[PDB]
Amino acid sequence: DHSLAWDVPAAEDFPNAAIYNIDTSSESPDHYLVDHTLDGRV
Amino acid sequence: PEEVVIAGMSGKLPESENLQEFWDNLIGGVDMVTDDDRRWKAGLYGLPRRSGKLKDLSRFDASFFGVHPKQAHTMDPQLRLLLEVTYEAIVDGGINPDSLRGTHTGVWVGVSGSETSEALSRDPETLVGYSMVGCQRAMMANRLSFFFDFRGPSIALDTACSSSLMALQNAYQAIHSGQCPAAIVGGINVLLKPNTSVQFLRLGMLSPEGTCKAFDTAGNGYCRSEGVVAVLLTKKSLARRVYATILNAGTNTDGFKEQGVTFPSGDIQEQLIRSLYQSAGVAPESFEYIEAHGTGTKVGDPQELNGITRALCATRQEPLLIGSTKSNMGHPEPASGLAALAKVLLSLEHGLWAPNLHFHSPNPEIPALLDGRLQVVDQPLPVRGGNVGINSFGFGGSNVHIILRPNTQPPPAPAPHATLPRLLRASGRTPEAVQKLLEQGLRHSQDLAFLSMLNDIAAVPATAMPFRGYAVLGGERGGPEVQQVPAGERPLWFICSG
Amino acid sequence: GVHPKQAHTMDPQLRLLLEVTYEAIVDGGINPDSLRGTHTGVWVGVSGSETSEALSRDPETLVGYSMVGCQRAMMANRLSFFFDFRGPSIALDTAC
């Protein structure tokens, strides 16, 4: 007896306003930002 | 020990509402992978477009299973589909489920994802408690044990991609040693969290085309798929219908590998295969078909088939048939093993080996394929008859392998009582179900075993299944009769006329 | 032998469990190298994957390592791989 339809999670129910962490560490993918230095301060 | 047989089977698979439709797709050459937008927008995050997805997930007969609507809405779709599929599988063997209530039956479930529980616990304030009871990983088996009233072990083991076959092996061990008289083995997998697919893609396992071109030169990676499969195992003295006999089933882990944890190993798999059908007492020449893992990777495929060739092709004369159901319906991670077992059993039942899709050129790295020793099933092939073997190697390292002796029971010789008209009784949730049962029974009026199996299961209390029907088979004045069954016990009274 | 980048993405449960397992083996006075290559099994009872949720929450930045280091099934397979145990490797999930 499949008359009724029950809930089921949707795509947007899972994560993905936006917050970005800028890390200048050597391993961090944004390490290159250390090059862009003006007046001796990055 | 005691013989272990696969009494019943059932489940839902991509683009297939049941096993009959699954076989129709398998032998018809229909590709089950699809480019639909059901789970999420195609191409999101760069993911491959194609994927094997079930027809529907939002269906569940809560009232029959005694689950209230509020609790049902928060149940994992995996669990609901598994409940339905398990009930369907139990009857498939002709066993009335009530016969097992209170027994020592055990349940093993191979589940590798709990995305639903994560989704339902999003908001700390909104979330309700009974959400966990229906979404917890362990609850996958405990719900089955609770509803069906099985007193045996209730476990839910991940073991990466080999969960289903690992559970099958554990159930075989339990039954073989007399711990349990029967067991339920299930593998469940659904696609609801695209981030998991993104993880797999970054790992490089997924193929951009989304096609598991097993054994072919163009092997890139497997395509994620969904499925829900359940199998009922019992000692031979209890089984009514036997699909096959489990001769042996072992396990072992690849251990330390220089290349990496994910890198498959061939020597370990060959050792496992050799040890299995050595301890089983079977000779290699008996094997007629080996369901290779056949993921489709560039390294996994050469490893396993080369391992199969060393393990079983060392002395046999005629070629050994090879196949991989993952080329038809993608690759369901945890339920991979049970899907392959279902394909093998269906092919044995119909006497034909389902073909393999997307195979055009053999992989040059595999000497056997170029040679005649190992032959792929690229088209329907009649079943000659012999032992069969299924293996499933989880990417983590766990390996599982089993050996089956297909059941070969010729139809009984005609008997005078066959001409006698027979009675068929059916019970269903709705009139459509009862009418379907009666029609199928009528179409096969001369299958005495089929009629007996149908009769045995129809005995269900009216409260659970309120519609009942019957039909006299072999009688000229025979028309199916259906009507609702009033609830409540009714006294029975005899009258001896004058 | 875990690369530093994989170490960060590994579930804390597994990171602690590796040390605990190694301590336990020696606690019995058994040099681990003795068991290498045997059929020792590994059964681990775990009922949580919170780390996986956190690491796999950003599609644009999540990396493939997390799956190997955070997958629940990997809880036992990692130990089997490191210690070279050829026995069964399972991760039970029954709660409590």
The DSSP string of B337-400 is HHHHHHHHHHHHHHTEEPP-SS--SB-TT-HHHHSSSEEE--S-EE----EEEEEEE-TTSEEE
Would an 8 Å CB–CB cutoff place A13 in contact with chain C?
Answer: no
For Cα atoms B315, B316, B318, give the angle at the middle one, nearest 5 degrees: 145
Closest CA to B33 of B47, B21, B23, B48: B48
CA of A27, closest CA in chain C: separation in Å?
A: 9
Cβ within 8 Å, pair C58-A27: no
First to last CA, chain A: 67
Q: How many angstroms separate the CA atoms of B81 and B60, rounded?
A: 7
Q: Helix-strand-coil percent breakdown of chain A, rounded to 5?
A: 20, 5, 75
Residues of B in contact with A1 (CB under 8 A): 61, 63-64, 429-430
Q: How many CB atoms lie within 10 A of CB B62?
A: 18
Helices (H), B93-193: 115-120, 130-135, 139-148, 163-176
- The answer to whether residue B161 is catalytic is yes
Which of C4, C5, C58 is closest, CB to CB, to A16?
C58
Alpha-carbon distance B155 to C44, whole Å?
13
Q: Do B227 and B339 touch, CB atoms closer than 8 A?
A: yes
The helix or strand, by DSSP H or E, that contains position B231, with its residue range, turns out to be strand B227-235
Per the CB < 8 A criterion, the answer to whether C52 and B115 are in contact is no
Min Cα–Cα distance to chain C from A4, Å: 31
What single string gives the DSSP state of each residue in B49-89? S-BB--S-SS---HHHHT--HHHHHTS-HHHHHHHHHHHHH
> C57 touching A, CB under 8 A?
yes
Q: Are B97 and B148 in contact (CB under 8 A)?
A: yes
Largest interatomic CA distance in chain B: 91
Q: Which of B161, B180, B223, B313 is catalytic?
A: B161
Which pairing describes strands B320-323 and B374-376: parallel, antiparallel, or unpaired?
parallel
The single-letter DSSP state of residue B413 is P
Residues B214, C1 contacting (CB under 8 angstroms): no
C96 is annotated as an active-site residue: yes
Cross-chain CB nearest to B158 (options C39, C53, C72): C72
- What tokens appear for B386 in the block? 């012999």
Round to whole Å and give the CA distance between B110 and B157. 5
User: In the complex, which subunits touch B with 3 or more CB pairs below 8 angstroms?
Assistant: A, C
Contacts of B200 in chain C (CB under 8 A): 64, 67
**Scanning every residue of chain C, which has its alpha carbon at the shortest distance from the alpha carbon of A27?**
C5
Q: Does B59 touch chain A (CB under 8 A)?
A: yes
Mutate to test the interface with A, among B17, B38, B59, B467 (most CBs of A within 10 A): B59
- Beta-carbon count within 10 A of B23 CB: 21
Helix B336-350 to helix B163-176 angle (10° resolution) is 70
Cβ separation A15–C57 shorter than 8 A: yes
Query: B201: which 2 tokens?
Result: 């893609």
Closest approach of B399 to chain C, Cα-based (Å): 8
Q: Extract the tokens encoding B103.
A: 């027994």
User: Long-range contacts of range B96-100, CB-CB < 8 Å, 24 or more positions apart?
Assistant: B96/B456, B96/B457, B96/B459, B96/B460, B97/B148, B98/B459, B98/B460, B100/B148, B100/B149, B100/B150, B100/B182
Cα separation of B403 and B414, whole Å? 33
User: Do B159 and C27 meet the contact criterion of CB atoms below 8 Å apart?
Assistant: no
- The per-residue b/e assignment along B213-226, b for 16 or more CB within 10 angstroms, e otherwise, is bbbbeebbbbbbbb
Nearest CA in chain A to C60: A16
What SS3 state is found at B312? helix
Instruction: Mark whether B360 is an active-site residue.
Output: no
Task: Say which amino acid occupies B6.
Answer: I
Contacts of A27 in chain C (CB under 8 A): 4-5
* Angle between the N-to-C axes of helices C74-83 and C12-27, in degrees from 0 to 180, rounded to the nearest 10: 40
> Is A11 in CB contact (< 8 Å) with chain B?
yes
Cα B280 off chain centre by: 24
